[PDB]
Amino acid sequence: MEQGTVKWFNAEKGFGFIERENGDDVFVHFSAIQGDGFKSLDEGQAVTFDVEEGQRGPQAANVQKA
């Protein structure tokens, strides 16, 4: 149920941040992005996905469009 709004994507590094109630700093990266043309993450759009926290660091995995 890791649904949230994409806050912004720092293309400088290649990381996107998505805002959640539990944490507004979810690292989304295009290594877990879907297809169907939806390979673009844009600030202010809503998405649904899964989040796997690593060694202090919640990253997004399995990204689906809301």
| Technique that determined the structure | NMR
Q: Residue 3: CA atoms inside 13 Å, Cβ hemisphere, count?
A: 5
Q: Domain segments of the chain: what residues?
A: 1-66
Class of domain 1-66: mainly beta
Say if CB 58 and CB 50 are below 8 A apart: no
Burial class (CB in 10 A: 0-12, 13-18, 19+), 57: exposed
Q: Which of 61, 58, 56, 52 minimizes the C-alpha distance to 19?
A: 58
